[PDB]
Amino acid sequence: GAMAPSYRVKRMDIAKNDEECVVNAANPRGLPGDGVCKAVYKKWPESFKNSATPVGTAKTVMCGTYPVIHAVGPNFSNYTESEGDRELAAAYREVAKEVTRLGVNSVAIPLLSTGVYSGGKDRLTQSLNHLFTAMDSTDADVVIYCRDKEWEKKISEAIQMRT
Numbered sequence: 740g741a742m743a744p745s746y747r748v749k750r751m752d753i754a755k756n757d758e759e760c761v762v763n764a765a766n767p768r769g770l771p772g773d774g775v776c777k778a779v780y781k782k783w784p785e786s787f788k789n790s791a792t793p794v795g796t797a798k799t800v801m802c803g804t805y806p807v808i809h810a811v812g813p814n815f816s817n818y819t820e821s822e823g824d825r826e827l828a829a830a831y832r833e834v835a836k837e838v839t840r841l842g843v844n845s846v847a848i849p850l851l852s853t854g855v856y857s858g859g860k861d862r863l864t865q866s867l868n869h870l871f872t873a874m875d876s877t878d879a880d881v882v883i884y885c886r887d888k889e890w891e892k893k894i895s896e897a898i899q900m901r902t
């Protein structure tokens with residue numbers, strides 16, 4: 740229950756976050772995969788024990804006392820725009836329920852479905868706006884992690900535009 744709930748963005752490996760829990764951009768089978776999920780597998784391998792969860796869902800597995808929230812955004816290559824948008828909205832909502840359940844003051848979160856699950860489309864505002872819609876009713880400090888300076892720039896732009 741953080742005192743003045745904020746949004747920030749950082750450009751670095753989420754595996755090196757300074758928050759009380761991490762959201763893994765997970766695949767539905769609980770496999771190490773690539774991208775966020777790979778660095779995450781290296782840092783918190785124990786968290787992948789029974790981490791498999793359906794598209795549009797989030798499952799928490801504790802590494803000791805450190806929660807890893809496995810959130811499965813849809814692969815837009817496999818879904819329609821409409822159904823993909825529904826599953827992506829749902830995954831973020833499930834992240835919010837988990838963050839609330841875990842009582843944490845802060846969460847590190849990537850933009851779900853913006854990398855190899857994007858179906859070769861820019862889904863920054865789509866993914867970010869679904870993140871906001873889900874996390875705006877929580878009181879955790881939210882720190883969004885990205886790899887690209889132009890993604891970093893536009894995310895902050897979008898955060899600042901609400902303040």
Ligand SMILES: O=C1Nc2ccccc2C1=O
Pocket residue numbers: 850853854884885886887888890891
């Ligand atoms: O946040 C980000 N999502 C991305 C997807 C593809 C390439 C770069 C990025 C980012 O920096």
Ligand SMILES: [Cl-]
Pocket residue numbers: 764851852853854855856857
């Ligand atoms: Cl992705």
